[PDB]
Write a protein that binds this ligand. Structure first.
Ligand SMILES: *[C@@H]1O[C@H](CO)[C@@H](O[C@@H]2O[C@H](CO)[C@@H](O[C@H]3O[C@H](CO)[C@@H](O)[C@H](O)[C@@H]3O)[C@H](O)[C@H]2NC(C)=O)[C@H](O)[C@H]1NC(C)=O
Ligand SMILES: *[C@@H]1O[C@H](CO)[C@@H](O[C@@H]2O[C@H](CO)[C@@H](O)[C@H](O)[C@H]2NC(C)=O)[C@H](O)[C@H]1NC(C)=O
Ligand SMILES: *[C@@H]1O[C@H](CO)[C@@H](O)[C@H](O)[C@H]1NC(C)=O
Ligand SMILES: *[C@@H]1O[C@H](CO)[C@@H](O)[C@H](O)[C@H]1NC(C)=O
Lengths: 48, 48, 193, 48, 48
């Protein structure tokens, strides 16, 4: 589990909240977002 | 009905124009508390 | 001393922290129009420390400067910017047409009188949608007697006597209830026990 | 009134039972002055 | 909204009756400096 999203409309019609935790720190941000219907983190080994 | 019960708070953030009235309420409520306490104590003393 | 302010529909809140808040520089910077405080006395601001000072910043018309007082009602207090009745802090305001007004008008300070209901305290709404002020569902960019954020005001310099733009900072903060960060310019002593 | 507030705790718990009958209390973490309407939310999963 | 006003030595008086007293469509027509009320609050006038 890595965090949360919170809001009123969740579809860029208004402002909404994103919280995310990764291997060393959080980010918290509040933007007029267009979220996806199913949010998740694709966190993979990048060869480059 | 004052901004705080702690008399030092009123004297830390209000001046004589405002601190005076804030203290008056606390005087009016605390004096009544003493009046009630003694009233009960005089009624109990009559029973003892 | 910012170049421009935020418009009061989208009022800009900046956090003051980890610093010394001497207010003497604020009025030695600019001879204000107002310096009005709630839950504190102006004389005591030097003797105290504030847990979290917060500067709301916006521009407001001279006829509406007093509408920033707690619990009052009227368009800006009903839809754009509201402080709660238990407001702690101070409101500073000053005239700004000398820096902030244009001979034709400064049509950049959009402000809204069109909302579904009175706004909540310390809330900011940027939803510039065609509000249904008409008796029918106004849809598309416009509709019957329906409008989004009013198209600002005629901020023209020699025109608006007591009615031109004023610059406003609402310092909102609480103190003596939690660890206080920003403090006054008083300097500490050695500690005795 | 605009602020979004968070609290948290970590309890060491045995193989006997989860969400257990004991007692613990959450300390606060951080306060976000977001000034936006919350009404819904969703947690965030990671998929490597 | 009237042509002239009966001067204060001879002040005018109109009884208004059998009607719905919306304030909202008329207080906005004439911007004013003084809106004082003496046993009622301006926010409640609409619901009395
Ligand atoms: C967890 O996510 C964090 C945010 O996505 C990320 O922090 C980001 O790290 C990069 C690189 O360390 C920063 O980029 C800046 O890094 C230093 C800062 O001094 C500069 O030298 C760089 O040129 C660049 O400016 C990002 O600023 C930083 N983002 C934030 C919001 O702090 C973490 O790295 C992520 N943690 C892990 C373990 O992946
Ligand atoms: C905060 O968001 C909620 C949710 O969107 C709003 O509640 C809505 O209010 C409208 C108007 O009364 C109703 O038609 C909706 O059905 C409500 N939605 C829900 C899910 O309850 C609320 O009005 C918003 N508050 C502010 C201050 O904007
Ligand atoms: C305000 O900014 C101007 C430049 O725009 C600068 O010349 C002036 O010294 C500043 N005043 C203060 C008190 O910082
Ligand atoms: C009254 O209404 C008339 C017609 O709209 C207008 O010309 C006049 O200026 C108004 N008077 C006042 C005092 O608003």
């Amino acid at each position: 589990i890595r965090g949360w999203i919170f809001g009123t409309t969740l579809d860029s019609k208004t402002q909404s909240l994103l919280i995310v935790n990764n291997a060393t720190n959080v980010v918290i941000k509040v933007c007029e977002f267009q979220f996806c219907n199913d949010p998740f983190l694709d966190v993979y080994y990048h060869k480059n | 009905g004052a901004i705080s019960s702690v008399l030092n708070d009123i004297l830390s953030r209000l001046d004589k124009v405002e601190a005076e009235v804030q203290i008056d309420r606390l005087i009016t409520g605390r004096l009544q508390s003493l009046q009630t306490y003694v009233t009960q104590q005089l009624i109990r003393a009559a029973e003892i | 001393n910012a170049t421009r302010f935020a418009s009061v529909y989208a009022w800009n809140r900046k956090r003051i922290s980890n610093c010394v808040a001497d207010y003497s520089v604020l009025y030695n910077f600019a001879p204000f129009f107002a310096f009005k405080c709630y839950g504190v006395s102006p004389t005591k601001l030097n003797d105290l420390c504030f847990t979290n000072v917060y500067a709301d910043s916006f521009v407001i018309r001279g006829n509406e400067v007093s509408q920033i007082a707690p619990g009052q009602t009227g368009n800006i207090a009903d839809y754009n910017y509201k402080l709660p009745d238990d407001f702690t802090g101070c409101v500073i305001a000053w005239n700004s047409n000398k820096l902030d007004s244009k001979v034709g008008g400064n049509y950049n300070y959009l402000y809204r009188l069109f909302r579904k209901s009175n706004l909540k305290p310390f809330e900011r709404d940027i939803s510039t949608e065609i509000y249904q002020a008409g008796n029918k569902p106004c849809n598309g960019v416009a509709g019957f007697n329906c409008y989004f954020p009013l198209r600002s005001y005629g901020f023209r310099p020699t025109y608006g006597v007591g009615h031109q733009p004023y610059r406003v900072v609402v310092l909102s903060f609480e103190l003596l209830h939690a660890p206080a960060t920003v403090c006054g310019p008083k300097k500490s002593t050695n500690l005795v026990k | 009134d605009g602020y979004f507030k968070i609290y948290s705790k970590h309890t060491p718990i045995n193989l006997g039972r989860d969400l257990p009958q004991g007692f613990s209390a959450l300390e606060p973490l951080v306060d976000l002055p977001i000034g936006i309407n919350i009404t819904r939310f969703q947690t965030l999963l990671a998929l490597h």
